[PDB]
Structure formats: C-alpha cells, structure tokens
Design a binder for this molecule. Structure first.
Ligand SMILES: [Mg+2]
Ligand SMILES: [Mg+2]
Ligand SMILES: [Mg+2]
Ligand SMILES: [Mg+2]
Ligand SMILES: [Mg+2]
Ligand SMILES: [Mg+2]
Ligand SMILES: [Mg+2]
Ligand SMILES: [Mg+2]
Ligand SMILES: [Mg+2]
Ligand SMILES: [Mg+2]
Ligand SMILES: [Mg+2]
Ligand SMILES: [Mg+2]
Ligand SMILES: [Mg+2]
Ligand SMILES: [Mg+2]
Ligand SMILES: [Mg+2]
Ligand SMILES: [Mg+2]
Ligand SMILES: [Mg+2]
Lengths: 65, 138, 258, 181, 50
RNA sequence: GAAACUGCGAAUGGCUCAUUAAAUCAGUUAUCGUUUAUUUGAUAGUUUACAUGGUAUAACUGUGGUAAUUCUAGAGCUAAUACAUGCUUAAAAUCUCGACCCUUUGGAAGAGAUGUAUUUAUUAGAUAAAAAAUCAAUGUCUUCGGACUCUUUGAUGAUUCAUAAUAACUUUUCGAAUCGCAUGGCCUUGUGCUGGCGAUGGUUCAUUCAAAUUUCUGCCCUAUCAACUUUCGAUGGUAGGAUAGUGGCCUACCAUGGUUUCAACGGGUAACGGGGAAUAAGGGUUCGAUUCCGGAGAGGGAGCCUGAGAAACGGCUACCA
C-alpha cells in the first residue's frame, strides 16, 4: 500500500526480477553486522509479497537442490 | 494536575506495560540521596514528575551541604534562601553581619514557607543561577 | 595556554628531587606514565643526581640507549620516564636492584635490595570493577590493571604483584593493626600501625597511625599504603624504619657517630 | 557566530558584564540541522576530539519499537502531526526528538499476523495457541492498524546521531496526545 | 611481492591471536573454579548458621 | 643519500600588562556533568589471500605565462603504514524458523542467527528477619507413592552505576593486504609444514599529561551614584536545537519573577591577581610591569580551515588605520 509501490497490473512483470534480486542479496555471507542486517531485511520483505510470490522465492531457493 | 503542559511528563525509561495490568498504580522510580537524608513518603507515593527532584529525578546530591532560611517562594519549584555569616575585620578586631542569597531547587514533595530552615545539597547546574537542591526541611 | 605544557621550571619542580636552583633554568619534566608528575622521580634525576653514575643528561641518554636500565623488569629508554613509589630499578651490568621508597625526610631514597626482593612489588588497590565481557579487574596505584582478581580484594587493600608475570601473589586487607607507610603530607615517609579509621561519608576519611615510639598522627586515607602486619613487612625498609625523630636528637646522634 | 559562553549574559543582579576574553573554540555552536522527510541526506561533522557527529538533513525511514510486545521494525515516516515545543515544526514537517509522527503500519501488522495468527503447519498452530493468551491489544492501537498509520514519538535526536528511531504511543501517552490532537 | 617474510608474518600473527584466545579461556575457567569453591563454602557456612 | 610523498611538531617556549572590580586570582570543592594526542597496563579464533585497484599523484622528463612573490598552467611518468577496497581460524552452547512422522507428556531432519562500534525500546542488576493453601503453565526424581536439598548476583554516602540480556537499526566503524634483524624445529625432501627477537598501527576500558565548567569565602575610591534588570532573556518551568557535555547558551509556549542601605546598579582607577618588598615596637600604611604560579594579547574589531589540543596570528579571510 505504499505510495511508490508497484501497481497491481505491473506486479506480474516486475516481481520476478525483484524476487531474483533479493535472492542474490540473500546469498551474501551474513558475516558482519551491516551484512547480517542485510540478510534480515531481505527475508522481512517476504510477508509484503503475495503468497504466490512468496512461493516462487522458495522454489528459487530449492531449484539448486 | 501533573499533565499540565504541552508535552507529557514521565519518568524516563520507566515503562508501564498495558498488557500485563498488574497494578492500578503506575510504576514509580525513586532513590535515596544518601548522607542519611530520608526520602519522604510523599515522593514515594506521590504522582508528580520532576526531573530535578533529588529522590525521583535524574540529579545526584554531591559536594557541600548548606543550611539557610527561606526568603522567597514566589517562583515555580524553586526558592531563594538567605545565609547569614560574620566576617572578621582585623584592623578593628570586630565582626560584621553579611548575607548571601542562594537560589535552590525545591522538589514538590516538600512544602516550604517563608521563614523555615532548609538544609540543601549541591548538585549539577540546574539553571542559570541554581546549583543547589533542597534535601531537608524544618 | 592553548594546549598541554612541555617545560618545567626548576623552581616549579618538586622540592624532593633536590635540584640545584642555579644549575640551569629548566628541570626534567616527567613524561606521562604510571605515576603522577609530583609523586614521581624521573630516571635522569635518579641516575645523575642520586647515583652520580652519569655527569650530564647526554650521558644518561647514552646509558639508556644501551638498554642497561630496567624498570619493573622492563627496559625503558626515556630519560624522563616517571619512576615512582615502590618501583624496582634494575642495573644488570652493575648488578644492583633498587626500590624507590621515601625516607623519613620525605625524599626518595637509594635503597638497595636483593634479587628475590626485586622479583616482586606492592600495589595499593585504587579501584575494583567489572570490565567488558563480565571480567573483574583491579587498578593499582601505578596504573596496572590485573584481571581476575581474588574476590576478597577490595579498595585500599594491597596486592603483591610478581613483576615477571604481572599477577597477584598475595594480598593484605585494610584493617586495624596493619603496618602502613605514609605517602603524602608532612608525615610523608613515616611508618606505623593503624589504630582507628574515622569515616566521613561524602568526605575524606582519616586514619590514626601509631609509630613504634608510641607517637600518634592522623592522616588522610589517600596517603596510607598498607605494607604488611606489625613487625613483618613484606618489603625491606630503608634505614630509620620510617620513624620520625626530633631535631635535638638529630644533633645528638650526628655528634655521637661523628 | 554561535557561542554558548555565559559571560555575554547579564549577571543575576542584572549588571552588564564587561568582555573578559575573545570567544574560545571550546564554547562554539553550530547551525541547527532541520531534518525533513525525504530521500536520505546525511553529512558528517567533525567535532571536538576525533569523534564525529551525523547530521540528518533528510530521512524518511526509522527503527520504531513496539514496547508492549518488545519488538522493533524499520518503517517509513508519513509526516509530523504534533510537536510540543513549537507548531511551526509541525507545519514545516521538521523531524526532532519528542515530535509526534505518523508511521506506516504494515510491518508491525505482518509481525502480529505471524506471531499470534490473528488479524487486526502444526508447529505454527502450536506456537499461536501457546501465545494466544497475549493476543489482545489496546483498542486505540488496533483502530490505527485498521487505518494503516500509527502514532509514534521520536526518541532519538536526528540532529546528533542521524537516526529517527522512536516508539509507538500507548495507554496514557496515546490518550493524552490524542486529546491534544 | 609475495615473499617468505610476509608469509611468516601472517603465520605469526595468526598464532599470536589463537594463543591469546586460549590463554583467556584458561584464565576464565580458573576464575570460575575459584568462584564456585568460595560460593560452596559460604553456602555451607550459611547452612551451619541455620 | 639530495628532492618529494608520508608521520609528528609547529597550540611548547619567549615577550607585554592593553582590557578586566566577584571578573581574574588565592585557598577550598565537584564532574553520578564532559573531551583527552601521547605514556603505561590490559584488551579482539565470530572479519585473489603464496596478498586487490587508480576509482593517482608528488618528486622527476618536457612545453610555458607574469615586472614582480615560499605564484604556478598543459602534457607525460611511478610508489606507500597515502587514498580506496577485501578474505582466509576451535568447539560448544543458546534462541528462532521449522520439512516430516504422529496425535503424543510428543518428537523432529534440517535452515538460519551470536564478536565489536552507533541509535532506539525493554529486561536483570535481590535482599530486617519465618512459616502455609490454592489457580495456570511446567521441569527434575524416585522406592509410582508423592518428593523436589546445597540453588546466582559486584561497587558507591547515593544513581537508570559497572556489567549483562532481548528486538531491530546504520551513506557506520574496528577486528593488521605494514616493516627491520636472524635462520631455529619437524618430517612423507617439498623453495612442504612450523617457528624466534623487535618496530609501527588498531577497538574499548583504566592510568598519566591536560582541558572545560563548577561549590564556599575573600577585592581600592565613590551615596552630591537609590533603586536596578525585564520591548532586543532579566528570574524560573516545560519541550526542542546546539554543545564533548550541565546550563536562557539559543529557540517556542508559559508564568513574574531576580538584586538592594548587610550599599544593588552606575561612575573612577596611572586595577593583570597572588607568592612577595619596604617600613613599624605593636597595631597598621604603602609598593608588587619585573626571575615562580595563574589569566589576557599579538595595531583595532569580526570570522574561520587544520589538528587531540587554536578562535593561533613568526596559520588564513574581511573591514578600519
Ligand atoms: Mg567522593
Ligand atoms: Mg605533511
Ligand atoms: Mg591598565
Ligand atoms: Mg565599573
Ligand atoms: Mg566567585
Ligand atoms: Mg609522539
Ligand atoms: Mg596502548
Ligand atoms: Mg598531470
Ligand atoms: Mg534541556
Ligand atoms: Mg524567547
Ligand atoms: Mg596594584
Ligand atoms: Mg606582579
Ligand atoms: Mg593567544
Ligand atoms: Mg606595536
Ligand atoms: Mg586571531
Ligand atoms: Mg613577530
Ligand atoms: Mg605565536
């Protein structure tokens, strides 16, 4: 519901890039206090996503396996 | 009425949890100043908020302890006491009455009238001229 | 002044160093270190004006850069290093160990000690407090911080520090009947036994000390240094055993030995 | 130009003091930093000693702490609603300590959904049931959650630390400030 | 330039830090034992007083 | 080993007494009200590596401007303990999220997180002394009945103190890409592994040199100076800003306060203060720019970069002469 938030019509196209970007940020070695805070943030934005979009991120995590 | 100003008055870092609701009375923090100075039960069970109160505020009593006579109480939460002493003149081998007026912060836990004897303790600078704080009344 | 001073006039120097007032215009300024400026003896004064081993400052520097002087088992090369009370000064080439202890007159005295005595020093416990990660530590009078102290050790106690390892070997509590050494006031350098400790909350505590001659004197607690139990000091004492003696008798025994 | 020296003031007796010495660096003062909502602009200030201070010229996010549940989240700042010292800061949307502000309600709402499973896996059900007794909250907070904007108070000094942390008003705090609003 | 001296310095630095950590652990353990012994004996004395 | 970069110093010292009448200064207090280069002591297994870049330049080569200066323009080069980046090292414990089995009194593979620094919110930091009954959750144990002991807490006269814990936060730090001398020990014989004495840096704490403010008392002449301060802060309260930090230091809103014949306020001073000097029998009177301590200044006002430290002046910038 943010003012600058992605519109629902455009949510389909942008979201895969957003999800994959956050995936790369999630793979940073969470090793220093700034870096650890970065990993916490990327997981904390998941509830903002709709459940179908939460699901695909989990699929991306499991694709390598 | 405690909450008589634009901002809320609260003891800093003293948190009352609405969820637990253990006691009706709001949690109140207090300390004993030392030097055998008794914390009045009014401060313990009172409802005022004063950051400069020696028993409930963020101020410590350290250094000289003086005594004086209240001379003025017309301002808010502070008074002006008078200390009288005798100064020695050697040439005439004789004394002279001299007096000095000291402004002292008084916590609302005390009720002081013009004429009573008050013992005060030094603290950090509270205002432009206030460097003392009332700690005992009589 | 717009910053810290770096010069010390001879007249403004501590009296107990006993410096000539006409030799020059400036005196050695003790650098920052374990002891305070007014309660410290710079190595230059000790090597030149006390031991007479060096004739001038340059020769003192030459000795120091040769690394022959050790303070508390550590080599020091600063001319103005502030050695102080209960400090051990070791000269290996000459084979001496000195302990800096005030005489009765109130001046640091050249007191020679044995090696086994030079292996340890004493420290008055100035502070005890928990450091980071919940590790207790004690700060002594010479700026030494020792971690993991014995819990019984408190402020005003004395700790026997082994120089090689810098750890507490034994300690003495501050109690009546203990042997004490005065490190300030006009009673500086005297030795006695505690009688009573008068306390004033929010003020300076006062201690009554009785000498071997039964004379009594009162001194502020900050100038008292516990050195052992009565008759059993943990360090070798200088000549006179910290007993103040009058002037007439001073004439007397000077004549007698003369 | 700004100095904190007390000599320039009149004496308590009202005498006009004479000018003892020229101003010293160790009673200096610096221009106020009127922090305002917007894209982050912070610039460092070299202060006395080697220490450094942060000046928040602009900031729009802050770490706010919900005290009742003992949680804290980062949240965007909506706008300043009330300030006790002076209303001109409210008008100009200047961020300072003790300023009452409005913050977004989404992250707290997500956290409460997840933690209690109520709205404002078996393991999830077990945890929710165990914590079910504490689910109830103040009605005033829940109404704001419905609205989506929560009232908060800034407990940090943006002009010093460069942060706009704060806490969510509750109980008598919230009632008093609502009355003032 | 990669030279044996740099390798030696790195290795010495690592060994120093590791040895420091081990020494601190040993000292902490000894302090813990001393505290436990004092705590036990004072508790025994309190039991005797009762 | 010239030159230059880098680091440190230049805020010390020396000089003068213009301003300054509770100001400075003397004695005596306080920082539980704050900064502190350096010395000294502690203190960091949690962070392509047989070791990263120009996101770069001086000195230097060469081409030039100006009458003139410790003036410098263009182009070409190359370094770091400069500048900017960036890993590599034990185990355990605890706390979350939890696939799945199973409906238990449940269990649980796994996936995460934890050093330090900053900011916020919350929690612990006990106690003058002794015994019981229940509601809820719920853990050890036996002789299945009920039982359940020795249970952890420092300092101060006093604190929201020291310290620790939980949840997040950061244009966010630190956690050695440095250097000298020497060539010891293990072997699976590899320029394999390991290893000595020092220098220089680095987080935090303490100490030291210091700084800042501060509590009480104490200054010459003048009453033919009697009321002063408050519109433009004077006294105090609340909140904020700023400060290294307290504080009308400043801002906004509030009240009307504050000093005074025990001389306020104003005026004079050829007034820097003191340790001291002279005189005197004692009381006193006078001197003290001048070998030491403390304060202020660099022709006069105003404003600043750097740095731990300056409102610096043998540092810079205006205005006045
Ligand atoms: Mg004290
Ligand atoms: Mg340079
Ligand atoms: Mg003059
Ligand atoms: Mg005047
Ligand atoms: Mg004064
Ligand atoms: Mg140096
Ligand atoms: Mg060090
Ligand atoms: Mg070029
Ligand atoms: Mg304030
Ligand atoms: Mg105003
Ligand atoms: Mg004079
Ligand atoms: Mg003079
Ligand atoms: Mg100057
Ligand atoms: Mg001139
Ligand atoms: Mg100037
Ligand atoms: Mg000149
Ligand atoms: Mg100069």
């Amino acid at each position: 519901n943010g003012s600058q938030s992605i519109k629902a019509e455009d949510e389909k196209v942008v979201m895969p890039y957003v999800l994959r970007i956050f995936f790369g940020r999630a793979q940073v070695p969470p090793t220093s206090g700034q870096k650890r805070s970065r990993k916490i943030a990327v997981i904390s934005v998941l509830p903002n996503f709709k459940k179908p979009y939460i699901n695909d991120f989990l699929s991306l995590a499991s694709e390598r396996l | 009425t405690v909450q008589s100003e634009r901002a809320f008055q609260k003891q800093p870092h003293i948190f009352n949890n609405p969820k637990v609701k253990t006691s009706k009375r709001t949690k109140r923090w207090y300390k004993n100043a030392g030097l055998g100075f008794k914390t009045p039960k009014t401060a313990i069970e009172g409802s005022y908020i004063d950051k400069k109160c020696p028993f409930t505020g963020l101020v410590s009593i350290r250094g000289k302890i003086l005594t004086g006579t209240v001379v003025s109480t017309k301002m808010h939460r502070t008074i002006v006491i008078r200390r009288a002493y005798l100064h020695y003149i050697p040439k005439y081998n004789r004394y002279e009455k001299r007096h000095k007026n000291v402004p002292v912060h008084v916590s609302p836990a005390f009720r002081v009238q013009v004429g009573d004897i008050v013992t005060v303790g030094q603290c950090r600078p509270i205002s432009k001229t206030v460097r003392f704080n009332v700690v005992k009344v009589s | 002044a717009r910053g810290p001073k770096k010069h010390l006039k001879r007249l403004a120097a501590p009296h107990h160093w006993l410096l000539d007032k006409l030799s020059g215009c400036y005196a050695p300024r003790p650098s920052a270190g374990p002891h305070k400026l007014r309660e410290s003896l710079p190595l230059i004064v000790f090597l030149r004006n006390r031991l007479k081993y060096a004739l001038n400052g340059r020769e003192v520097k030459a000795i120091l850069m040769q690394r022959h002087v050790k303070v508390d088992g550590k080599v020091r090369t600063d001319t103005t290093y502030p050695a102080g009370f209960m400090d051990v000064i070791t000269l290996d080439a000459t084979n001496e160990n000195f302990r800096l202890v005030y005489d009765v007159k109130g001046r640091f005295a050249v007191h020679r000690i044995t090696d086994e005595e030079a292996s340890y020093k004493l420290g008055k416990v100035k502070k005890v407090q928990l450091g980071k990660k919940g590790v207790p530590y004690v700060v002594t009078h010479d700026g030494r911080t020792i971690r993991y102290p014995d819990p019984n050790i408190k402020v005003n106690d004395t700790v026997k520090i082994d120089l090689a390892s810098g750890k507490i070997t034994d300690f003495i509590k501050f109690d009546a009947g203990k042997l004490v050494y005065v490190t300030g006031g006009r009673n500086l350098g005297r030795i006695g036994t505690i009688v009573h400790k008068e306390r004033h909350d929010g003020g300076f505590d006062l201690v009554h000390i009785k000498d071997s001659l039964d004379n009594t004197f009162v001194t502020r607690l900050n100038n008292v240094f516990v050195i052992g139990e009565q008759g059993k000091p943990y360090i070798s004492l200088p000549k006179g055993k910290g007993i103040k003696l009058s002037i007439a008798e001073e004439r007397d025994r000077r004549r007698a030995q003369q | 130009g700004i100095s904190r020296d007390s000599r320039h003031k009149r004496s308590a007796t009202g005498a006009k003091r004479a000018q003892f010495r020229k101003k010293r660096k160790f009673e200096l003062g610096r221009q106020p930093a009127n922090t305002k909502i917007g894209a982050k602009r912070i610039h460092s200030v070299r202060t006395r000693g080697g220490n450094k201070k942060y000046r928040a010229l602009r900031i729009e996010t802050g770490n706010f702490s919900w005290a009742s549940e003992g949680i804290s989240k980062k949240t965007r700042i909506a706008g300043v609603v009330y300030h006790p010292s002076n209303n001109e800061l409210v008008r100009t949307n200047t961020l300072t300590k003790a300023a009452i502000v409005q913050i977004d309600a989404t992250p707290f709402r997500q956290w409460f959904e997840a933690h209690y499973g109520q709205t404002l896996s078996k393991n999830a059900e077990r945890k929710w049931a165990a914590r079910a007794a504490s689910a109830k909250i103040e009605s005033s907070v829940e109404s704001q959650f419905s609205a989506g904007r929560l009232y908060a108070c800034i407990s940090s000094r943006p002009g010093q630390s460069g942060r706009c942390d704060g806490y969510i008003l509750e109980g008598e705090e919230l009632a008093f400030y609502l009355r003032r609003l | 330039l990669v030279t044996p001296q740099r390798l030696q310095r790195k290795r010495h630095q690592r060994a120093l830090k590791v040895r420091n950590a081990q020494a601190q652990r040993e000292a902490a353990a000894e302090y813990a034992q001393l505290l436990a012994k004092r705590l036990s004996e004072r508790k025994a004395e309190k039991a005797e007083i009762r």
